[PDB]
Short mmCIF file of C-alpha atoms and ligand atoms in Angstrom, two decimals:
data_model
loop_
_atom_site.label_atom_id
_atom_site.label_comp_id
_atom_site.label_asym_id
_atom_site.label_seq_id
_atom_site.Cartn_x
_atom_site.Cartn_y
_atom_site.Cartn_z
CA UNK H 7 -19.82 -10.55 -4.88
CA UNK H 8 -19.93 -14.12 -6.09
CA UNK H 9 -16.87 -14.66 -8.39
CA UNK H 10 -18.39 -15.34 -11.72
CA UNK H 11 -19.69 -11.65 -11.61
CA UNK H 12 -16.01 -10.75 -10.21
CA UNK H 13 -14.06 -12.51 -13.23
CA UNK H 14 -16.71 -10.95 -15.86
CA UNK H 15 -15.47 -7.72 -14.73
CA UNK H 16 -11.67 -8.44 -15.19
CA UNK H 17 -12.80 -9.78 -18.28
CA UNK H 18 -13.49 -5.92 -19.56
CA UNK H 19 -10.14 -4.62 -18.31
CA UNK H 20 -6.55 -4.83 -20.76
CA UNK H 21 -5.63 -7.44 -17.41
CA UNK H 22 -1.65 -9.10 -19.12
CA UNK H 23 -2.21 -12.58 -17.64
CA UNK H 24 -4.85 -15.25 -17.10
CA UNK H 25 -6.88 -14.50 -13.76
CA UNK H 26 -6.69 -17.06 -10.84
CA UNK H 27 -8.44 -15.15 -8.11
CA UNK H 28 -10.15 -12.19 -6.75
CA UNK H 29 -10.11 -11.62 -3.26
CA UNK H 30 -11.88 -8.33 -0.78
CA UNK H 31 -8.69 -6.56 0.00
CA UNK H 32 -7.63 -4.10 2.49
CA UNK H 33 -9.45 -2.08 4.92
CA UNK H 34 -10.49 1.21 2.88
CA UNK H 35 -13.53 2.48 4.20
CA UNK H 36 -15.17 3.77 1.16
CA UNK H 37 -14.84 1.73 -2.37
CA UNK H 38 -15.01 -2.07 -2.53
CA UNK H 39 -11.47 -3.41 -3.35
CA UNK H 40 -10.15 -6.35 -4.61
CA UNK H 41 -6.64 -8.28 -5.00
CA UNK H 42 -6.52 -9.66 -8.48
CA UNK H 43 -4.13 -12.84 -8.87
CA UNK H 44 -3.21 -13.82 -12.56
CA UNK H 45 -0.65 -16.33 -13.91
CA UNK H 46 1.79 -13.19 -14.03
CA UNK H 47 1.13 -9.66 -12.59
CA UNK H 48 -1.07 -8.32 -9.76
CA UNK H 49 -3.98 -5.97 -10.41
CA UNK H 50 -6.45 -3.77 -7.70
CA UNK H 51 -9.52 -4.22 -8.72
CA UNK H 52 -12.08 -1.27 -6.91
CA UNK H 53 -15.86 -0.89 -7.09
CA UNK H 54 -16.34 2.95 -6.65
CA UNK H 55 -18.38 4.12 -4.61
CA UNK H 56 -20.95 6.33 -6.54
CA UNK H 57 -23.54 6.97 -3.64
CA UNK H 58 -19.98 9.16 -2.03
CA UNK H 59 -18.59 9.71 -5.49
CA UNK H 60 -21.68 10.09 -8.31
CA UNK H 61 -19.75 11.49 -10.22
CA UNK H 62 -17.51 8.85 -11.68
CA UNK H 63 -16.54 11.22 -14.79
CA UNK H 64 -14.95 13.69 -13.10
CA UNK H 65 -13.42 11.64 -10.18
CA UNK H 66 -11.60 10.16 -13.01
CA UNK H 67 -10.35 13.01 -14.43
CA UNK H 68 -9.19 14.18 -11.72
CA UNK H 69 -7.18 10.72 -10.98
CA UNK H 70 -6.26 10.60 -14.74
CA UNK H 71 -4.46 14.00 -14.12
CA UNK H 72 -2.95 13.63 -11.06
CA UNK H 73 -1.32 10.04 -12.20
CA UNK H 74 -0.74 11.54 -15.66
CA UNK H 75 1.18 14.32 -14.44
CA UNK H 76 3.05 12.53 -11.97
CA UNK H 77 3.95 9.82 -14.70
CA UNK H 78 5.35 12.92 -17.38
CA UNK H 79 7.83 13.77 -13.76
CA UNK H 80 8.85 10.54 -14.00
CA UNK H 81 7.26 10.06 -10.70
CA UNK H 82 5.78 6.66 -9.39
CA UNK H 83 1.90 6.71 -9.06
CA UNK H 84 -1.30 4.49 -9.35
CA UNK H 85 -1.14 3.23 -12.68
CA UNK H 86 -4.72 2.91 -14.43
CA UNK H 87 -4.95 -0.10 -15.68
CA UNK H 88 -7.17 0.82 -19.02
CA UNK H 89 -10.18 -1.21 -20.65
CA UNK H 90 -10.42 -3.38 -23.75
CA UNK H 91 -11.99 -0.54 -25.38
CA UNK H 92 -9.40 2.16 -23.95
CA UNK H 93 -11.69 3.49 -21.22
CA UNK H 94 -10.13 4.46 -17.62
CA UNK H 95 -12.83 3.05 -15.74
CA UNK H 96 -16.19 0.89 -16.94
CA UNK H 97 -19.82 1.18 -15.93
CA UNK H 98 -20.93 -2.42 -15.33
CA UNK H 99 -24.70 -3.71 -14.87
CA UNK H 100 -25.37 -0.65 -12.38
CA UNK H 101 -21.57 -0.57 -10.85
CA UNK H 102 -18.86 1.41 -11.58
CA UNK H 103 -14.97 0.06 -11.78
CA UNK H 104 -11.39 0.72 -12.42
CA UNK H 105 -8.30 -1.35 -12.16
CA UNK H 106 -4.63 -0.57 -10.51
CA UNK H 107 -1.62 -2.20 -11.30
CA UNK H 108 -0.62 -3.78 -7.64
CA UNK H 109 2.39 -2.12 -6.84
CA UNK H 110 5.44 -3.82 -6.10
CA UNK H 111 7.61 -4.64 -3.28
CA UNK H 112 5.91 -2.19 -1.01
CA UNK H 113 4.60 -2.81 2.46
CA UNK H 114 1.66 -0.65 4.02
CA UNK H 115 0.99 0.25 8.04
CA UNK H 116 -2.52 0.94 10.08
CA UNK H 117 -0.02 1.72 12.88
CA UNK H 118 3.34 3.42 13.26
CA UNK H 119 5.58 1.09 14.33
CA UNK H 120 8.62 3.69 15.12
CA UNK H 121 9.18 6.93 14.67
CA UNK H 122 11.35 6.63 11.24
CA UNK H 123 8.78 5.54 9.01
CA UNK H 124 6.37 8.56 10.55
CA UNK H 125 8.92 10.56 9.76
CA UNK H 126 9.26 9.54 6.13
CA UNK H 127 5.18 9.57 5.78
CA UNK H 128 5.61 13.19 6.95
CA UNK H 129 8.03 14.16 4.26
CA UNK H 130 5.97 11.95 1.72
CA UNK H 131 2.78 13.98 2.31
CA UNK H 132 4.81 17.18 2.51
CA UNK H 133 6.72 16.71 -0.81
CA UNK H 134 2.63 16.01 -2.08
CA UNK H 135 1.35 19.17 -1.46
CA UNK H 136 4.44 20.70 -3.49
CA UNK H 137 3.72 18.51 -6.31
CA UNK H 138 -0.06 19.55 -5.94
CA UNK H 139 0.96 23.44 -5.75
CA UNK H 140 1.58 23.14 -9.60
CA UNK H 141 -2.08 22.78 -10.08
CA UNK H 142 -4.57 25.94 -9.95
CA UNK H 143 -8.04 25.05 -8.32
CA UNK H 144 -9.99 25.21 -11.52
CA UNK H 145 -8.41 22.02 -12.93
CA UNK H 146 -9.41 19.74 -9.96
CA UNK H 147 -13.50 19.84 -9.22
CA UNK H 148 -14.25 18.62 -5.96
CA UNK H 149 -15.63 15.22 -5.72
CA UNK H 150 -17.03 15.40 -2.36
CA UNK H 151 -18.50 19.34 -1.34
CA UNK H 152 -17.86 20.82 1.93
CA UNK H 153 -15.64 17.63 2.81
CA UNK H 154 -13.51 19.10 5.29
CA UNK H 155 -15.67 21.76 5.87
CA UNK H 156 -15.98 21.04 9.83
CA UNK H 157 -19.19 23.28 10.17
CA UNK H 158 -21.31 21.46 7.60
CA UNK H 159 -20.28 18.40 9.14
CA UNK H 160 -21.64 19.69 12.33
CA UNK H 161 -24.97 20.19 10.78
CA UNK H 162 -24.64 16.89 9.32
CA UNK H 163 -24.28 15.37 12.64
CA UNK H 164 -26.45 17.59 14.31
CA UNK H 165 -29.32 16.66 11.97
CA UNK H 166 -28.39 12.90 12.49
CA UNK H 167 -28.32 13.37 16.60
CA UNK H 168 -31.99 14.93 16.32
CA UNK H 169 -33.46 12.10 13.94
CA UNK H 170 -31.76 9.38 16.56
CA UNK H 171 -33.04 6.81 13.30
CA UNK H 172 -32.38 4.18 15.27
CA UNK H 173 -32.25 4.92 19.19
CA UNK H 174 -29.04 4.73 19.25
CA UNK H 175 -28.49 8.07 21.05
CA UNK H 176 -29.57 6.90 24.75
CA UNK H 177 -26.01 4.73 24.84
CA UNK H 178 -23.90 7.12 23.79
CA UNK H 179 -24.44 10.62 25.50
CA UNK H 180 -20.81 11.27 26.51
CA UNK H 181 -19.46 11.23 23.44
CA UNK H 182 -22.31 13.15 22.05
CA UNK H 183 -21.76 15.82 24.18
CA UNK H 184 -18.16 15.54 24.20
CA UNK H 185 -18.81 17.31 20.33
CA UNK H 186 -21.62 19.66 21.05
CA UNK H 187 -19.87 21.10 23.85
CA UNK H 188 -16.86 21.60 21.25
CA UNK H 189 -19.15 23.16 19.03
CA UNK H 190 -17.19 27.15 19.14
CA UNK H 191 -13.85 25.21 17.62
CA UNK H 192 -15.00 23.78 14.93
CA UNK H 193 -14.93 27.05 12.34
CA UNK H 194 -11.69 27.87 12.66
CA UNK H 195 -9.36 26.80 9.26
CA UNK H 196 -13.24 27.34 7.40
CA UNK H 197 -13.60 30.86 8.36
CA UNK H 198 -9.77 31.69 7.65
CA UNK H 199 -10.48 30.57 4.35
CA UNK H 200 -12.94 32.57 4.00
CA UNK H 201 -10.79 35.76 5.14
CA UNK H 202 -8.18 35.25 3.41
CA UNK H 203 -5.91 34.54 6.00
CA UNK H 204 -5.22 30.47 5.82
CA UNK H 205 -4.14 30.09 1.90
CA UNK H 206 -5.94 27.88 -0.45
CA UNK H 207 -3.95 25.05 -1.67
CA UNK H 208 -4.44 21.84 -3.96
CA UNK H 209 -4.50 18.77 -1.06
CA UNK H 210 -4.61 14.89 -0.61
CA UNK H 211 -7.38 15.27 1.89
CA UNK H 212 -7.17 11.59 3.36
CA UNK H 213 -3.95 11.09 4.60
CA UNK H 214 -3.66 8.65 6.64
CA UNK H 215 -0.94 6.27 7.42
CA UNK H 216 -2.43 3.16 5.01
CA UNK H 217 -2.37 5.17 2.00
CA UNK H 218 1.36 5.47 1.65
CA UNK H 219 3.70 2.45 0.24
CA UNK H 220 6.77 2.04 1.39
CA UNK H 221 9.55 0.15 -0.64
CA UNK H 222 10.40 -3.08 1.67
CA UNK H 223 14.06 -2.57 1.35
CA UNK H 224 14.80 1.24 1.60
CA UNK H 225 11.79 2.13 3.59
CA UNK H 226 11.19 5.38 1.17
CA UNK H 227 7.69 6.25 -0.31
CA UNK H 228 7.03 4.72 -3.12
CA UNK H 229 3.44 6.07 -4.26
CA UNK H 230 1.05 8.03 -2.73
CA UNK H 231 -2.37 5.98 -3.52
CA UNK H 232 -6.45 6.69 -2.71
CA UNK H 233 -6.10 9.91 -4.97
CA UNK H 234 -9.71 10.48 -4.68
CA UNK H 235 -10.03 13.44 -3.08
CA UNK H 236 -7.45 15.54 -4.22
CA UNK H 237 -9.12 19.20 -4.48
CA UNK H 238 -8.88 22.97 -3.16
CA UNK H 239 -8.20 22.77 0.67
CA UNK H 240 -6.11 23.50 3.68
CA UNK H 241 -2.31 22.08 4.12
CA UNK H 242 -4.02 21.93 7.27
CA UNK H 243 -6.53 19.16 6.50
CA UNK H 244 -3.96 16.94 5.11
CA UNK H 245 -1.51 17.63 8.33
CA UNK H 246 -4.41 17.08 10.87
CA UNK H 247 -5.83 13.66 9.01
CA UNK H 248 -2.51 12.15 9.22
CA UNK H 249 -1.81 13.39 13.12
CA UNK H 250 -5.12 12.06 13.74
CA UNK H 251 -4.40 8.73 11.93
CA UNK H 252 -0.59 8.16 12.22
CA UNK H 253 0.23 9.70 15.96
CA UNK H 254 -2.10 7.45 17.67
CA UNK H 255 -0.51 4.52 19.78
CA UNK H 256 -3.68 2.18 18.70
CA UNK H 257 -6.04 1.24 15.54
CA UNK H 258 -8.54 3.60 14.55
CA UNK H 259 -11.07 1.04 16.19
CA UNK H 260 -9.40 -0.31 19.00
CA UNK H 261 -11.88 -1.35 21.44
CA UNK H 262 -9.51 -1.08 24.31
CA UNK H 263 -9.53 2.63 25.12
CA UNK H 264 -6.44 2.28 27.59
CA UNK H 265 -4.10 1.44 24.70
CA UNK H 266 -5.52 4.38 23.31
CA UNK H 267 -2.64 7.63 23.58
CA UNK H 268 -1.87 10.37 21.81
CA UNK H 269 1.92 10.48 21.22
CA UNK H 270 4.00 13.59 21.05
CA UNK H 271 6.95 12.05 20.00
CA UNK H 272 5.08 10.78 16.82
CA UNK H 273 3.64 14.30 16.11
CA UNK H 274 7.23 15.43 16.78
CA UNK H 275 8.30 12.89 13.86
CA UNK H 276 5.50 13.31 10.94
CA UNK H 277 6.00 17.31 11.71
CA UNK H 278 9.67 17.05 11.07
CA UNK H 279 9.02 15.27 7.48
CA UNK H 280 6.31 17.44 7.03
CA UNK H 281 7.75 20.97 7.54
CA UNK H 282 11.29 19.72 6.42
CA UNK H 283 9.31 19.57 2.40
CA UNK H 284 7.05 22.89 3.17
CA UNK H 285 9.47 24.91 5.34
CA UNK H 286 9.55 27.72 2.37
CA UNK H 287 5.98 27.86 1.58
CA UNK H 288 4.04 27.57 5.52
CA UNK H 289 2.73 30.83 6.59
CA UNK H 290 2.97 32.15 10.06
CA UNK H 291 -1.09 31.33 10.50
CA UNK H 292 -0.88 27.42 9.23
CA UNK H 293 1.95 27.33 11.45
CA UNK H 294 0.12 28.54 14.29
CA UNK H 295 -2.76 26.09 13.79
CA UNK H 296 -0.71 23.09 12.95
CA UNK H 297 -1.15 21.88 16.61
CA UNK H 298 -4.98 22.13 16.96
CA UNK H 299 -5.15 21.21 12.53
CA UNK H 300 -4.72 17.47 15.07
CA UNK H 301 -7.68 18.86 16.84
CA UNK H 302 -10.33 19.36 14.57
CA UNK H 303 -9.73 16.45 11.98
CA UNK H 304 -9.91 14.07 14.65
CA UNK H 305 -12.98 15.43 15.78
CA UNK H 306 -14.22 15.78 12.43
CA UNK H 307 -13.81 12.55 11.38
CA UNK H 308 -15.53 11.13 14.98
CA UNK H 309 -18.43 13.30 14.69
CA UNK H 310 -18.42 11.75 11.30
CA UNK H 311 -18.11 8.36 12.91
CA UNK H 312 -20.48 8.80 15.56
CA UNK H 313 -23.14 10.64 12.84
CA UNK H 314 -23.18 7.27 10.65
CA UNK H 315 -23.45 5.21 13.79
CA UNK H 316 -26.65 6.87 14.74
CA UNK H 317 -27.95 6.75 11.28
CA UNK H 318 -27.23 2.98 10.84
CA UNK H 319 -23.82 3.18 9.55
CA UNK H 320 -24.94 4.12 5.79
CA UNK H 321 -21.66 5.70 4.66
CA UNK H 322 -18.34 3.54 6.66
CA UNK H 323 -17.93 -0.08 5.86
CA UNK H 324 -18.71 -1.53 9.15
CA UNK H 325 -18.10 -5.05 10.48
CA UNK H 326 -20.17 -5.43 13.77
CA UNK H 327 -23.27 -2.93 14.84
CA UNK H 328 -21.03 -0.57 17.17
CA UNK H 329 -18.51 -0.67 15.10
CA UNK H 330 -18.66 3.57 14.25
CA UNK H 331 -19.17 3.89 17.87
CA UNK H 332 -16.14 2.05 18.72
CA UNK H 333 -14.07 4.30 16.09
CA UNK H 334 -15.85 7.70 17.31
CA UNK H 335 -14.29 6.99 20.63
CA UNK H 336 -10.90 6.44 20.04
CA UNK H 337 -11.15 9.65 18.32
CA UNK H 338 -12.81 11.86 21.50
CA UNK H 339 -9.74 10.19 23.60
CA UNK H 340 -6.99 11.33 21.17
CA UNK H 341 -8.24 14.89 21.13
CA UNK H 342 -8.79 14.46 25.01
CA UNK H 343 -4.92 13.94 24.72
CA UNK H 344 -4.17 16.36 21.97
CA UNK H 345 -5.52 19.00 24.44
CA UNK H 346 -3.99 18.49 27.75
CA UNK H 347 -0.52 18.33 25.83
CA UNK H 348 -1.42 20.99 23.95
CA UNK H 349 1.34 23.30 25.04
CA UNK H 350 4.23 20.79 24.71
CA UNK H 351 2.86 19.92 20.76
CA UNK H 352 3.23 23.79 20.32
CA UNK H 353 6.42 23.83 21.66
CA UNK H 354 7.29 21.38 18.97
CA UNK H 355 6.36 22.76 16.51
CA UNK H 356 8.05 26.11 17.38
CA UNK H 357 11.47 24.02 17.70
CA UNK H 358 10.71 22.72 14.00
CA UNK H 359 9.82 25.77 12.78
CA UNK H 360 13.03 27.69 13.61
CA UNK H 361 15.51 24.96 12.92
C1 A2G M 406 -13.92 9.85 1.05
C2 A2G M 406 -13.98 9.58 2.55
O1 A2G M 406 -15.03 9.76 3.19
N1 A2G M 406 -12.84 9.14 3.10
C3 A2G M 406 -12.75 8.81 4.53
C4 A2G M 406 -11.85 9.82 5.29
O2 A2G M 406 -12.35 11.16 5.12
C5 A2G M 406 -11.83 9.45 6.77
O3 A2G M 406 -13.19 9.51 7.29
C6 A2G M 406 -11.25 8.02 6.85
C7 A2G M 406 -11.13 7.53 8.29
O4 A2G M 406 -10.39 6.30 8.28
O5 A2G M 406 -12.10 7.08 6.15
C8 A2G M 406 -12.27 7.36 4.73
O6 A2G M 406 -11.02 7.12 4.02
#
């Protein structure tokens, strides 16, 4: 947006210097964020997303709680900056927004650039989802339904492959078939759920790599950030999202499949973190399915991908027209990998498991 409607709406936040800029910031999919620069301190400045989110009361609940309770641990989080009026978030001429403090000192990766800092994502994420286990289910409403429910996205996809909106389908039947013909897979951390068998925890449910800081001196965590989907799901979901994510050799839309791999000794890494948090509470059965957990949220999220791009990309920021298709394939390629080394990223996780 043009930035006299940008500085109006720092103008209704409790912002502690004057504002010099506002400038699009990072590469989040979903809201519409925002570097603000003042005479003193840094501030986030996010557009949520309502047609994802509609529910902007509750999504900030749920982020109020989270950050509160985290805060009363003496635990580093997003920090809300409030408005004028006290608020946590403001509803402006149609839009909703909220403001961050920018956190300090911290650098960010969309690619692993050794094994060390997958590693300390791993035991990041892992150390989450003991923090999380303090909630019960009934506290934190989901603000997205059936969101890692692979099934439902199957109909989604399967609804969006028989409209073909926009004729899009004709140039891209291998990777449509590549997940119809996986079609029997896709139930399996839903339907143990269901039985009983996979436990219901509190999760993150977007993991990935560029939603951890890390301090630029030590390397540790600092915060956990993009808090917007924390709800009921699988430790599974939040493992898988950040195998699929975080043990891939390229970008999530790297256009040059070649460079795209699938690397074990990445997996190897995050799973070490990971299980070296959660080694008291992971059941035989999540253990079992942490190998294919890579699997299926990979192909989730590239049916997902490959969905919007035949619909016209209505729900990922894009920047070019094949932009979702470019992103769905990486995806198919990784769990091409994640498949043929299937037995060696079991053997893995065996090795962790014991030790
Ligand atoms: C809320 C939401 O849809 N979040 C998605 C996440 O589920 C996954 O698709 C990711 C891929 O980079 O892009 C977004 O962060």
């Amino acid at each position: 947006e043009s930035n006299e409607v940008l500085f109006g709406i720092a103008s209704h936040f409790a912002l502690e210097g004057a504002v010099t800029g506002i400038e699009p910031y990072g590469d989040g999919h979903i809201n519409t964020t925002y570097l603000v620069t003042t005479d003193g301190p840094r501030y986030i400045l996010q557009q949520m997303n309502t047609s994802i989110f509609p529910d902007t009361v509750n999504l900030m609940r749920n982020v109020e709680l989270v950050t509160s309770t985290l805060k009363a641990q003496g635990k580093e989080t997003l920090d809300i900056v409030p408005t004028t009026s006290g608020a946590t978030w403001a509803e402006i001429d149609g839009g909703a927004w909220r403001v961050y403090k920018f956190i300090e000192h911290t650098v960010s990766y969309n690619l692993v650039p050794n094994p060390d800092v997958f590693r300390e994502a791993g035991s990041a994420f892992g150390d989450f989802q003991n923090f999380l286990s303090e909630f019960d289910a009934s506290q934190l409403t989901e603000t997205i339904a059936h969101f890692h429910d692979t099934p439902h996205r199957f109909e989604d996809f399967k609804a969006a492959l028989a409209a073909d909106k926009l004729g899009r389908a004709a140039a891209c039947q291998p990777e449509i078939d590549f997940y119809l013909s996986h079609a029997d897979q896709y139930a399996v951390v839903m339907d143990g759920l269901r039985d009983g068998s996979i436990p219901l925890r509190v999760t993150h449910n977007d993991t990935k790599l560029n939603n951890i800081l890390m301090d630029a001196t030590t390397g540790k965590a600092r915060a956990i950030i993009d808090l917007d989907t924390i709800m009921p799901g699988s430790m599974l979901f939040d493992f898988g999202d950040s195998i699929r994510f975080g043990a891939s050799t390229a970008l999530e839309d790297e256009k040059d499949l070649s460079k795209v791999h699938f690397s074990t000794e990445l997996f190897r890494a995050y799973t070490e973190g990971f299980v070296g948090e959660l080694r008291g509470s992971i059941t035989a059965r999540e253990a079992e399915l942490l190998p294919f957990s890579g699997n299926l949220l990979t192909m989730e999220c590239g049916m997902r991908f490959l969905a919007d791009y035949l619909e016209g990309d209505i729900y990922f920021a894009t920047k070019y027209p094949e932009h979702n298709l470019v992103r769905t394939r990486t995806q198919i390629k990784l769990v091409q990998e994640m498949e043929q080394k299937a037995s060696e990223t079991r053997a893995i996780v065996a090795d962790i498991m014991e030790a």
